[PDB]
Design a protein around this ligand. Sequence first.
Ligand code: NA
Length: 278
Amino acid sequence: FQSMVSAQWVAEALRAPRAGQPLQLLDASWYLPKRDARREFEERHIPGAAFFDIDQCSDRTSPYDHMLPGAEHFAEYAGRLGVGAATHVVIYDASDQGLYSAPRVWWMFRAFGHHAVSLLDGGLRHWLRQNLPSSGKSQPAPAEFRAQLDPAFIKTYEDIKENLESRRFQVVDSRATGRFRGTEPEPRDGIEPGHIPGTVNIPFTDFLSQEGLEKSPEEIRHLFQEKKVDLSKPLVATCGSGVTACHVALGAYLCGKPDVPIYDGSWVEWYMRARPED
Ligand code: NA
């Protein structure tokens, strides 16, 4: 329950606060090389917001980028960012779509045991149309954050591979149609486009309005039905590198289905390890 917060909710909760129930805004902007999320933050951001670096708060040994980090690493990261036991996290991003990389971080706090995490509707795109309540860097104090990762939130290469036979869960890919069909290139050097056999293409953009807001739960229910996805049966989301897949997990969450694991490795890992030849 209660996973998303509006542009007006956040304006009020700051001029609150409350006692034993703190707030902490986050700019989890992340882009494919095309924009500097940290420099853009320092130029323009929401008061109190600290920048959440998706590639920094990641597994330090993997050759893949923004793989879920270890429990001790996420505790040290979230802690130093102003997140504790009673903290209420609100994540946004300055993306053109409204929300893009923000649901990835929403999913991350949930996976490590901190369910007191919400998302800002429309992100910064709509924090512009609806008023203008900043510059600088940012300075929150620590933590004593505890992290216990629930592996039920993540699917591995082997799980996806073995599902090709078992069919125990539905797989939704949130990449653009072109990339999924194999008609548009992949943004990574040497990686070819295409998709995992038996997966459904539901691009992450289908979950949002042209305004950039999240579609209604009834609209998302209609989408899942039209794409031939049964929200009563198990569902796993995938994409290019495990970022926009969390939009699918969010869509299903707002429909009453919180158990939607993410294939963290996603297309880049699949292309590397399965080596599809066409
Ligand atoms: Na480091």
